From Swiss-Prot, chains A, B:
Positions that bind L-tyrosine: Y61, D105, Y198, Q202, D205, Q224
Protein name as it appears in the record: Tyrosine--tRNA ligase, mitochondrial
Organism of derivation: Neurospora crassa (strain ATCC 24698 / 74-OR23-1A / CBS 708.71 / DSM 1257 / FGSC 987)
EC number(s) reported in the record: 6.1.1.1
Chief site of localization: mitochondrion
Region (Involved in splicing): 1-37
GO CC terms of this entry: cytosol; mitochondrial matrix; mitochondrion
Short motif 'KMSKS' region, span: 275-279
A single GO molecular function term of this UniProt record: identical protein binding
Reaction catalysed by this enzyme: tRNA(Tyr) + L-tyrosine + ATP = L-tyrosyl-tRNA(Tyr) + AMP + diphosphate + H(+)
Family stated for the protein in its record: Belongs to the class-I aminoacyl-tRNA synthetase family.
Positions contributing to ATP binding: D65, K278
Amino acid sequence: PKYTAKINEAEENWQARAEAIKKGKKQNTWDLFEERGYVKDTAGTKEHIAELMRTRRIGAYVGIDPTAPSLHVGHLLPLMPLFWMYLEGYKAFTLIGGSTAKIGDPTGDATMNMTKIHYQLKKLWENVDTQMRARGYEADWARKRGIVNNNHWWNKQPMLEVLRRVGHALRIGPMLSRDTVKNKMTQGDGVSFAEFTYPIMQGWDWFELFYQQGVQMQIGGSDQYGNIISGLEVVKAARESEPDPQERKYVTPKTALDECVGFTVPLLTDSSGAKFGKSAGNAIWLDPYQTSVFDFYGYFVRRSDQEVENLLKLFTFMPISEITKTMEEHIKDPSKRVAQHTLAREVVTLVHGKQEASAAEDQHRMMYTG
Amino acid sequence: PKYTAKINEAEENWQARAEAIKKGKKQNTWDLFEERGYVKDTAGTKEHIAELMRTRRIGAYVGIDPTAPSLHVGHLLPLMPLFWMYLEGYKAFTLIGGSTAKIGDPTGDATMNMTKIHYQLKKLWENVDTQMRARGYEADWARKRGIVNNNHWWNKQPMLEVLRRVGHALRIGPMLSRDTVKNKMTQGDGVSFAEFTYPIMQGWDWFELFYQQGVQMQIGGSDQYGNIISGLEVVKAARESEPDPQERKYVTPKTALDECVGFTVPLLTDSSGAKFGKSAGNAIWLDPYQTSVFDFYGYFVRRSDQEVENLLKLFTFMPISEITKTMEEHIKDPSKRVAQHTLAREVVTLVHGKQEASAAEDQHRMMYTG
Ligand SMILES: N[C@@H](Cc1ccc(O)cc1)C(=O)O
Ligand SMILES: N[C@@H](Cc1ccc(O)cc1)C(=O)O
């Protein structure tokens, strides 16, 4: 009865939204992704992903392996489109790779790390809510966010079941004919069986999130394209191999838009080759105990004129009109770092909050700042 | 106290045996293996395996994947040295690959198959006991036989634990640079992830048998050499990665003779290329409902003069002196098929029992036999 009525109202709301998009009254979140610059590679055509996003209140996820006690600003990039979807009323999850960090992604303390990353994600998600309220988005019952740790299934998930459900459908050649698996096996050491199996586990992760939460979309870091391709194979195998006739009603695809999709975000460097979120020989951590707020703000205020508009698009919830006005002010006199102070203000506001942001800005407008 | 006293007497008996071998009073079972022709390839040096067998009442196993409801005579070959060890007072196991049959060994109904194979192995093991008594071997408390199904661990064994315990130690290159994995991936279809993982599961099987039963030796079919090499890596990884300090006392090797070893049996064909145990386009099944006893006996009575001594050595418990006397009678007039009737009599006696054997011999000595 009553969850059902609410689900029905949600779908009806979603469908009026869908029609509004078809008529051009409302921008498709997919086209927002393209406009702001989040799309590098897609697993699924852009027409596919657009239409899935228009017609269905999907779930989406980003996975993070807790390889250290703090996230850094480089982690923010895949999270940003995820947060945009959340603001738009999708279901959005950050998956902590508690079990999968121990294998480690080859593309190219641990419990305490897992605890700290959960804490930090919860803190950031709360700042997203704050920003959602500040940017004028209305409450929506069907809007959902969550934090999931893949140890929830990996602690007991039988190997046999994974091999039976997906292992016969996945051929090792495509896994092997992929640049990471050819790279570190030619130049660099070898690939461990555990390393080789990592993409299969991440694919099973996606299956579990599809099954449990309706997650049809994975958003990946810039180097996650191969893992996403493999993950789709794993999820497809798993949905097709479901033995129970009753579960198949729910899990086996019937229609084209039932399929899963994904995309990756761009690789961000400056014109000197530096990786975004690295300032010298260290990360810009989200933890103030590791990187002071002043220094976090500093990182952003030092961004280049050449990259700053692109970074305002990626790392803020500023409407494009707002960014355009900022850039119009900024080019009057770039030496004033209007755009960079805006970027710093917005990103600090998201990670550390408005008060910390104001204080840091005041400090960076002193006559000496380092 | 009392299992302990019995274990101590067993070890003392084993050590008098060991000294008797060192002094040449008693043949090392390893040298029996060599004399009778069971040794093709060894994982571990022959000096290693010999000394392990002299000094330690090891456990050994043969794995069989239940891919059909009956075993056939080709299955007997790896079982024979295993049965010899049993007669000599080792611990000897036949492992049914209940879970691993579903993946299937790539080297180159299902529940009912598992039930029938268990039944047949139990029946054969009982005939081994009969033969043990008939060949003059004395009761030994420490002599042990068993039938184990790897579904005992595979039904619930977590993938994560397997990957953490062995997955980092096993490199995919050696797995990949092996002829089977290069064969069916070049010529022939692909290799499924499940296929590629099969040797890891069989290696974990061996670990479970080492842990549970003290099994240090695997005997393999003629094509199982690669699987045995991989299995040793898996068992070594697993014994070295045991996290508990108390378990390490028992599971982590301390000495050279603590290591696991294995060997394979020869590939048996006749001079026309036919696979041993194939008579035309069908197997010679151990099940009388599939291959009559008459026809089973017939298969053996038709063996060639060129191969019959070799087959008496492999497929019977006849002392070498007995086989020599048989061959001395046989060469007086080969047309009488003395040696072949002896081979038929002995193998039928093992699989179907002495009464069935006598009847089949009488039938094959009629003036018309097909
Ligand atoms: N493999 C990703 C993280 C990840 C982990 C688990 C997942 O299910 C998804 C993504 C990385 O290292 O960047
Ligand atoms: N792989 C072997 C059978 C086997 C199965 C499991 C084991 O643990 C050992 C051996 C075969 O097909 O001949």
